[PDB]
Structure 1
Amino acid sequence: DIVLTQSPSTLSASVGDRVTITCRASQSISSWLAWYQQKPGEAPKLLISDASSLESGVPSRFSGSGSGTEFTLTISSLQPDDFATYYCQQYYSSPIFGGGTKVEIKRTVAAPSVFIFPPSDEQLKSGTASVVCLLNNFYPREAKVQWKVDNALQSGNSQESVTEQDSKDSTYSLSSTLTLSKADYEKHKVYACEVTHQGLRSPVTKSFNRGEC
């Protein structure tokens, strides 16, 4: 019923930064808003209630403000323990959560290393062809992966998976997997993965010819 909108959806921050997360409500909720923190593999933890009332045991670093339709969670100086997802939640009417804001580790730009894998002959014997395009150790997360078959843009026959930020270098890795039937895979020659990323001076295309591979 009451729509809560968080901005930004992803917040790239470095340790020591002053972080601000806003929550915007479709209607006034007075000050009946709570903020939660959640890390992967864990239940949420309440930080603030009634828009600015800090929960017991929560560091002074965290503060909340706002009322009506505009609320803000602020972290004075970000710490290592603060990289997580934060959600706002209204309770003026039936409860609703905002979409969440991921506070992620900011590092320097890192271009992806692009690799391409043709389907193995064993998989082709089973009737399916999976073509895998790997974008390794890159930052930021935003990347464009397009599949081209005989220079024909593909749409909806591939799905991608991304890793969580690496513990050591804070980079991402991504896989884009194009799936076809073996019968259809054998009707085309050139398989290309085109990668567009802000760390690359120009788009990188990794391709192969079915027959040679």
Structure 2
Amino acid sequence: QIVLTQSPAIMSASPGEKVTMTCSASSSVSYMHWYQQKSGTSPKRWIYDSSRLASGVPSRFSGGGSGTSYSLTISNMEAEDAATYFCQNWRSSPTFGAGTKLELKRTVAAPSVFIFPPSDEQLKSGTASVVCLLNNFYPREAKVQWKVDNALQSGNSQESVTEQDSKDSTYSLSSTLTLSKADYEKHKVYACEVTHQGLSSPVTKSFNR
């Protein structure tokens, strides 16, 4: 069967850069459709019949190609273009390509760090969650470590990271440290330490229980 290979699988582009993503077919195909998806929402029709923009799609997008190679081009990369783009052709199986995830390459931005002690309502249920928020940073690489009194913690926290913001192109990260109420009461100082390219030295946010 006809296979579609999108390249590159992941790309990052500076604002205003001209960006091209390709969709290659193992055998000749006569047209290509393109869909844009951002996390948490349905795919959107983007370019249809190879070159036709759906209503509302900005003119910076264009599409072309023939035979074994079709492409989607953005003439000047914008923050809102950070998304996954899938090519699609009904004579191919699978009919969708695996997607190109496009990111915006912005300037380095240091995280803003916040710490949140457990709520009274949670403590009453026998559990303590402490949350550390790293807000609006770039690039995505970040180290967050919990420190309880003298000691770095291991295996009792979980981190989650947002997709790149459509406006400012940053990421945010939450780290949640969870302990039983009884373990929580055994210690005094709760701290999260944050390392990031945008910081000259590690940032520590902390509170006393």
TM-score (norm 2): 0.71
Classify 1:76/1:155 alpha carbon distance in 2 versus 1 (closer, same or farther; 3 Å).
same
Offset, 1:36: 1.7
Query: Which residue of structure 2 aligns with residue 17 of structure 1?
Result: 17
**Alignment deviations for residues 160-194 of structure 1 (CA, whole Å, 9 cap, x no partner):** 25375274x55443322222221232344543322
- Describe the SS at the equivalent of 1:30: strand
d(CA) in 1 for partners of 2:174 and 2:206? 15
d(CA) in 1 for partners of 2:24 and 2:199? 36
d(CA) in 2 for partners of 1:60 and 1:193? 43
Query: Which residue of structure 2 aligns with residue 185 of structure 1?
Result: 184
Q: Could you tell me whether the CA contact under 8 Å between 1:37 and 1:85 is conserved in 2?
A: yes
Length, aligned pairs only: 201
Q: Which amino acid aligns with 2:201?
A: S
Query: Which residue of structure 2 aligns with residue 55 of structure 1?
Result: 52
Q: Could you tell me whether the CA contact under 8 Å between 1:20 and 1:73 is conserved in 2?
A: yes
Offset, 1:121: 3.9
Query: Which residue of structure 1 aligns with residue 172 of structure 2?
Result: 173
Q: Which amino acid aligns with 1:124?
A: L
d(CA) in 2 for partners of 1:111 and 1:122? 33
- Unpaired runs of at least 5, structure 2: none
d(CA) in 1 for partners of 2:151 and 2:82? 41
Offset, 1:48: 4.8
d(CA) in 2 for partners of 1:9 and 1:133? 29
Query: Which residue of structure 1 aligns with residue 86 of structure 2?
Result: 87
Q: Could you tell me whether the CA contact under 8 Å between 1:112 and 1:138 is conserved in 2?
A: yes
Q: Which amino acid aligns with 2:141?
A: E
Q: Could you tell me whether the CA contact under 8 Å between 2:9 and 2:99 is conserved in 1?
A: no
d(CA) in 1 for partners of 2:161 and 2:28? 40
Q: Which amino acid aligns with 2:165?
A: Q
d(CA) in 2 for partners of 1:134 and 1:5? 35
**Alignment deviations for residues 24-72 of structure 1 (CA, whole Å, 9 cap, x no partner):** 67xx2434653222356454214155xxx3126574741344765x754
d(CA) in 2 for partners of 1:189 and 1:3? 57
d(CA) in 2 for partners of 1:137 and 1:64? 36
Offset, 1:78: 3.4
- Unpaired runs of at least 5, structure 1: none
d(CA) in 2 for partners of 1:80 and 1:164? 9
